[PDB]
Amino acid sequence: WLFFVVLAWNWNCWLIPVRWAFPYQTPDNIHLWLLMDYKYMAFFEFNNRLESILSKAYVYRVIRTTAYLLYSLHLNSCLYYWASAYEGLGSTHWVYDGVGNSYIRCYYWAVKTLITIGGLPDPRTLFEIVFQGLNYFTGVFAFSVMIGQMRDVVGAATAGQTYYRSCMDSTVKYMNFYKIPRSVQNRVKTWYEYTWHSQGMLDESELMVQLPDKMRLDLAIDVNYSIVSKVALFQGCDRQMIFDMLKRLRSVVYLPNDYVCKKGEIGREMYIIQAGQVQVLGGPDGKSVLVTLKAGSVFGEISLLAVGGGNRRTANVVAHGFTNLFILDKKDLNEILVHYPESQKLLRKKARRMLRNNNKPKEKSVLILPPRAGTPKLFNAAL
Amino acid sequence: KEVVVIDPSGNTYYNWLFCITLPVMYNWTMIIARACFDELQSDYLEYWLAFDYLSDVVYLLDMFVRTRTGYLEQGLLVKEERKLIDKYKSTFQFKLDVLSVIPTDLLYIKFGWNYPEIRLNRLLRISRMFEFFQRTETRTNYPNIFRISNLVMYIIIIIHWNACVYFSISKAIGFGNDTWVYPDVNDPDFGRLARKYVYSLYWSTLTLTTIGETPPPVRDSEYFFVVADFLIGVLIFATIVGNIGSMISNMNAARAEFQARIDAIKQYMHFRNVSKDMEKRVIKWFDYLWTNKKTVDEREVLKYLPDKLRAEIAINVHLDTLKKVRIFADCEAGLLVELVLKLQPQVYSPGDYICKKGDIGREMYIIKEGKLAVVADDGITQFVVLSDGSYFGEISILNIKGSKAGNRRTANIKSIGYSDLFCLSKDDLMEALTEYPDAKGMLEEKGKQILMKDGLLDINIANAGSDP
Amino acid sequence: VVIDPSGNTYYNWLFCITLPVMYNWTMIIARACFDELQSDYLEYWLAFDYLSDVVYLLDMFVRTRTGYLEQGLLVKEERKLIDKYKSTFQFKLDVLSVIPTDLLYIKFGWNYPEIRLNRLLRISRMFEFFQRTETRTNYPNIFRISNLVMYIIIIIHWNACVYFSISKAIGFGNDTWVYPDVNDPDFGRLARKYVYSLYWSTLTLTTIGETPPPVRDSEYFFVVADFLIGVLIFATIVGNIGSMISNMNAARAEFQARIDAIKQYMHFRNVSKDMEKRVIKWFDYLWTNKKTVDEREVLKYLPDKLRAEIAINVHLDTLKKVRIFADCEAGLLVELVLKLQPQVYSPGDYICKKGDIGREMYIIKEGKLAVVADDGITQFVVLSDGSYFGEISILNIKGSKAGNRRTANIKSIGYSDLFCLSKDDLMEALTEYPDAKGMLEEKGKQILMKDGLLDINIANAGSD
Amino acid sequence: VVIDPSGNTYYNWLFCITLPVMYNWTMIIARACFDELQSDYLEYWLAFDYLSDVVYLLDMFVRTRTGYLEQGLLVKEERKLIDKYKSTFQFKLDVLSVIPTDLLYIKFGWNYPEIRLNRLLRISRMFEFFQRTETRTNYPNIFRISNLVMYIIIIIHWNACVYFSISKAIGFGNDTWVYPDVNDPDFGRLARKYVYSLYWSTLTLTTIGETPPPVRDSEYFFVVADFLIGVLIFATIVGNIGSMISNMNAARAEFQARIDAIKQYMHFRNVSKDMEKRVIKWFDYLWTNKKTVDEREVLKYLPDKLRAEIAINVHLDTLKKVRIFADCEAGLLVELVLKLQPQVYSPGDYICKKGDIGREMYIIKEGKLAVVADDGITQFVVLSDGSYFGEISILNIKGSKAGNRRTANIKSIGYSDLFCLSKDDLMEALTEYPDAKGMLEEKGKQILMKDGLLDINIANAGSDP
């Protein structure tokens, strides 16, 4: 409906002017009016739709505005013509004898007298000053709204980049407050560059809070179901518990030659890999690279069970470069298990069985699960 | 000493303000437009010498209603003179009061009847004129026509002043001694106050729109004049465009924010490949959020009000249905108030399984407008409609002895359209009950009564109470 | 024999330096480019050069008398300051700007008295005088707009001088575009030429091209360059003005945005109209009386000590008079002081009711309250200021007559603004000093002993 | 060969490639329309055309180098780059611009360039160079306006050339509007022929018309374009400059807003004048230096791995010079230092007076402190950098027997900027190293046994059951 409606409205608003005052045009080609004489916001709504549905969000407003401008030009032309007709004389008494040039000289006269430039005309009678004033104002209005739209678009376009430099130069001046050696400058610079590129944002958490609830769960269940809901340690329990466990997770990114488990430290964390590759190293010497995990793997899981890494981590680890592995701490584990004490007893029983087999036996891979993973069965069954 | 006082915000104030505007606006034009010409002065002074005195006496009256307006002390607005006046006498804004009423209509004795330029004082009572429509904007229905109307007014008065000045300078060299200046006048068709003014106005407007369709200067006094005129026209243009730009930027700050958020969510979604069904669902939820204009959240909309107003609005909006629940009947409202103060909304999407199976269900859910149904494990016909005010989840919120394997309801419920219900919490009910140690017994007694009358397996074991 | 780099004596001397530099910046081009202004007013122009030279010389001594701070105190020994100035970048700029270059004056006679162009670079001092004077203005938007206009005038001046020079270089009257002639009776009076050239330059820099057409080669180049410069100038001006007008209308927009948000919501849930009017009048009151902002976030910028000093200076005179704080040590008092939370009421509000929780100890500041029985109006007592209204419900003691009931029925009369104090905060505060608690409860029990004291016998705690 | 897409050498080659890519954008039009200008110097036309084509094809020396990053591993490929580029886009133009072009003008001579049209396809190096350079400069202010100026000059050049072309098309002198005529000195010469046209071009591009009526149809197209593009040019330049000048200053505005709010508060509860003096002096000392920030939020969005480096860089020497913490595993200081907070501080204030039950750690740093007894008289030993006093209270040592006193009456003389640390923070931070707790406890015990006065020694367990 919109296409034909706007065509018809442009036609009926534009053809009539020259067909009421300009002398030799209303009977000359009287076919369009004769055969087409047969609170609006739908046009605005569908322009809104087209901006949304099509890549362009500016051509529609541009064409509407320039159509308004040329419509105003034509309407001013017609109204001064009718002012002359009502008064009898005036309004380009010499149109230069022909429609083919009458049209062009008419809108040339309109664009000439657009604001106040005058030129040829001289004071003839009353109301001329007021006439020139009104035309002046309408021209100024159209021009001003054009600049307004332009600055609108420029500002709305170049939005986050200014903030990006604001962060960067603020922190560089700060860090420079105390004369710190260059290495960390280079490190922080490349960190910032890599983060900013290919990501756009800087901390996706702040989007999560603004966005509602009850769909964040759907996002998390569409993203991180697999790797977690397969590990035998947390296997086979209340499905409605793991959801909070998931909801509290946090990302991090490392760089080349990055210690993560420097041997001889405590540790309280279970890492997990999303897109990268890390090497289980065997010391600063010739790289005892036993294996390098690829993706969808887990590491250091036992340390979350009542003792964080046994006051000394398993083995040294370093990274090639950019890793992007998630992180999950222990406080979350204890809080989720106290909210849902259904499985706290079974995880706890596994923990005592592990500590009781940590001293007297070795138990490489023979008695790990069946006595540990056996305790989930009856324990939560006692809920 | 008990004088009556007007309210400093009542409609009387507004109407008197509209009264005191006409005279100063009249004096801001007619004095100079009478100094310029001389064929209205000494020609129409009959009505003029009358119209002047009414405005003088209205100025005098203006000096009055200022001293009888109060100013609150401590929720109390002082309501007597002899100190309603001391502050006004001691402040500023009284020097103008001294100056701008002095009758100097005697200097005409040394200046005849051809100098109505002696009245260069009535133009100091302008703060009131400003304030009138500086303030009336906040009372109107919709602004954003008022600013442009004001700018139009100011520019028009400017051009009138300049059309005055041009004639004033013209009649100092001789009518017709040049070609730039106004022509000679003793000839006919020229000099009857209908041509002596419109022509000047035309010339002034052309000159200040600065395009140059008039004969050029020749005498070297106006080489100053035209320069100054151009240097003022530029500033006029700058002011109008800057003002309209700020206006047009301000009245659109919602769409930009909404589009920025949709941008962020689109980028994040297409950063880790998710099923496209989620894209469809997410976008067909965002459009729903936008369409009924529900972008804001009830959490933060209300966060700035003082606490009390929040209390009254909350109690008004919802206590009826809480008192409509099938258990809370004989509850001291000194509890229901803090209970109501603890509600949090939930809003849902089509085809969401709320509980659907054996789970904990440790909350309280009451339905607003929306449709819910209870089904079996599979996608079959509904068994009951939770049409308009239905609710379950009540008995779960407590923990009574000898329950029927509590907090593991296995019913199957599901949303279809859009629901937007509300939620409560067990722990909060505990903490807000802590201070009324009498109802708890009644509540648990009623719960045991209903559970027993439900024909269920309450183990009904006697309590221990062995050690008090 | 010293001064701070921030005292008003330094400010006045900063103004004092400013007078000659602006003077030097303008006259030089005109008085070397018209050649009529000199050759007849020389006696006017001995003392000015003398003055400017000696002013430069004396000022070059200031930089070795004003110290700087050494981490806690102002350096006040010159050798470092002499070393400091020697290390300053501007010192060599000073030396360049103070060079006596009139050794060529005799050699060049008076062909070019423009050789003193040297003394034209100590302008950063004018710049910092600008940047230091906006910080202490009553209302500075006007100031900056004035500075803008000053700059525009200066540029117009330079353009006019350039045009006249190019005309005299080409030769008077060989066309219909150059400056017309010199031997006529009027275009020789030294007053026509300056002003005509000013008019010329302004008409060129404006938008329309309507002046006499060009013929020669250089003038098309000149015209195009001036057109471009003019466009740039106009853009700068409009941008600056728009920036100011935006910064001025800041608050009102967001204020009305908040009000609109509230109304938009309050339409959604079908609320009643009376509170509509109440909230609207509330907003209007708070707007008019210039107390729109909320005090909490307002205060928390200063560090600890200053915040504490402000806090004590508006409260440590009422608490000194509460009944039960007869013999409390200062530290406990201050620790209490820092936990008072503003509330505000309006005429006709039930601040409390009968027989409910006793959980606060009000201390009114600037209001009026009265106790009205619900039955009609039977006002008993009106309280002016410094009213306790409490002071025992917090200090819980055994055998309370009616533990935490407070059947009083008070009500505000109009627009009172009262602080408050909680009880968990009192416990957390008193935990530090485990001594006074006993004496406080003791004297409170004595106060009760003067009247009723209980509703039952003493619950003697003879545990030990 | 292998290159990284972020390196100074890569920028230098970008500058070299972008240098001769504008010849193809300007000189071609002049030589196409202003005939007999090439005839002046054909010893330059081809003499630079060869250089242009040499570099224009040597650019592909890098489209096979400069590998793409993969899975967080460095660009280290030698054969997948070429077929990557081929499968992807930007290879089509990279050859479509590269017809040898010498097999058509042979039908027309070695004189004119208007068949070099297709070499106007490779415009990405200049765009990329412009966007890349600004992220390294110091003064991003002038760059954007310089860029816009260049663009405007170029479009003026185009319009001038097209006007003279359409002039050449029609008979010269048949109307005043067209270029006047030839067969006349300086009206049939070169320099005037284009300068005058340029002047005419700017005049007509400005909307206001000083021109005759139309000759016939198909001439008004010029003024049509003139207004249609003049409006857009002016609008965009104004918008850009306005946005940039607006954004330039906002810190001043925010500082002023804060000062305004605080002043409105203070002159409302009848604060006495002296306090107003003190607070305004403090905000002065704030703004007149570079101390006008709060560093806590500055380091907000760093990774959860850093700041221990710079931490131990700044807070380590004096902290290691203490008589309680010295015996410790470095992990202890690593956990500790990360939790401190600053305390800037104004001259002339008693930090602590005799009689005080405060509990905090206080480290002097780059200032001057000094303690008096009772009335600011008879100053005792001065406390220079790297010092403190007391600090034993922070731990509830058994038998402290005099704690909670701080009988010092300490005072500050000049701007001090010392440091602070809480107590419960220390207690929480000792949830992993229980062993050292006993040794530090006994250290305090022994030091207060002799250096401290007589200890009570009667401390014992209370109610066991």
Swiss-Prot record, chain A:
Subcellular location: Membrane
Segments traversing the membrane: 1-21, 58-79, 89-131, 132-159
Amino acids binding 3',5'-cyclic AMP: R313
Source superkingdom: Eukaryota
Region span, Selectivity filter: 116-119
Ion conduction pathway: annotated segments: 57-156
Known tissue expression: Retina, testis, kidney, heart and brain.
Coiled-coil ranges (or none): none
Annotated site location: Central gate: F143, I147
Site label Occludes the pore below the central gate, positions: R151
Annotated positions binding 3',5'-cyclic GMP: G300, E301, S303, R313, T314
Stretches assigned to the Cytoplasmic side: 45-57
Stretches the record annotates as Cyclic nucleotide-binding domain: 239-355
Side of membrane Extracellular, spans: 22-26, 80-88
UniProt record similarity statement: Belongs to the cyclic nucleotide-gated cation channel (TC 1.A.1.5) family. CNGB1 subfamily.
Function description: Pore-forming subunit of the rod cyclic nucleotide-gated channel. Mediates rod photoresponses at dim light converting transient changes in intracellular cGMP levels into electrical signals. In the dark, cGMP levels are high and keep the channel open enabling a steady inward current carried by Na(+) and Ca(2+) ions that leads to membrane depolarization and neurotransmitter release from synaptic terminals.
Complex formation: The rod cyclic nucleotide-gated channel is a heterotetramer composed of CNGA1 and CNGB1 subunits with 3:1 stoichiometry. CNGA1:CNGB1 channel binds Ca(2+)-bound CALM1 via CaM1 and CaM2 regions of the CNGB1 subunit; this interaction modulates the affinity of the channel for cNMPs in response to intracellular Ca(2+) levels. The olfactory cyclic nucleotide-gated channel is a heterotetramer composed of CNGA2, CNGA4 and CNGB1 subunits with 2:1:1 stoichiometry.
This protein's domain notes: The cyclic nucleotide-binding domain (CNBD) comprises three helices and a beta-roll of eight beta-strands from CNGA1 and CNGB1 subunits. Upon cNMP binding transmits the conformational changes to the C-linker domain of the S6 helix to open the ion conduction pathway.
Name by which UniProt lists this protein: Cyclic nucleotide-gated channel beta-1
Organism: Bos taurus (Bovine)
Swiss-Prot record, chain C:
Residues at which 3',5'-cyclic GMP binds: G390, S393, R406, T407
Annotated region described as C-linker, given as residue ranges: 250-326
Recorded catalytic activity of this chain's protein: Ca(2+)(in) = Ca(2+)(out); Na(+)(in) = Na(+)(out); K(+)(in) = K(+)(out); NH4(+)(in) = NH4(+)(out)
One Gene Ontology cellular component: transmembrane transporter complex
GO molecular-function terms, A-Z: calcium channel activity; cAMP binding; cGMP binding; intracellularly cAMP-activated cation channel activity; intracellularly cGMP-activated cation channel activity; protein-containing complex binding; sodium channel activity
Region described as Cyclic nucleotide-binding domain (CNBD): 329-450
Positions in the Cytoplasmic compartment: 63-88, 131-138, 247-464
Sites where the protein binds 3',5'-cyclic AMP: R406, T407
Sequence segments annotated as region (Selectivity filter): 207-210
Keywords associated with the record: Calcium, Calcium channel, Calcium transport, cAMP, cAMP-binding, Cell membrane, cGMP, cGMP-binding, Coiled coil, Glycoprotein, Ion channel, Ion transport, Ligand-gated ion channel, Membrane, Nucleotide-binding, Sensory transduction, Sodium, Sodium channel, Sodium transport, Transmembrane, Transmembrane helix, Transport, Vision
The protein's role, per its UniProt record: Pore-forming subunit of the rod cyclic nucleotide-gated channel. Mediates rod photoresponses at dim light converting transient changes in intracellular cGMP levels into electrical signals. In the dark, cGMP levels are high and keep the channel open enabling a steady inward current carried by Na(+) and Ca(2+) ions that leads to membrane depolarization and neurotransmitter release from synaptic terminals.
Domains as described in the record: The C-terminal coiled-coil domain mediates homotrimerization of CNGA subunits. The cyclic nucleotide-binding domain (CNBD) comprises three helices and a beta-roll of eight beta-strands from CNGA1 and CNGB1 subunits. Upon cNMP binding transmits the conformational changes to the C-linker domain of the S6 helix to open the ion conduction pathway.
Subunit structure comment from the entry: Forms a heterotetramer with CNGB1 in a 3:1 ratio. May also form cyclic nucleotide-activated homotetrameric channels, that are efficiently activated by saturating cGMP, but poorly activated by saturating cAMP compared to the heterotetramer with CNGB1. The channel binds Ca(2+)-bound CALM1 via CaM1 and CaM2 regions of the CNGB1 subunit; this interaction modulates the affinity of the channel for cNMPs in response to intracellular Ca(2+) levels.
Name of this chain's protein: Cyclic nucleotide-gated channel alpha-1
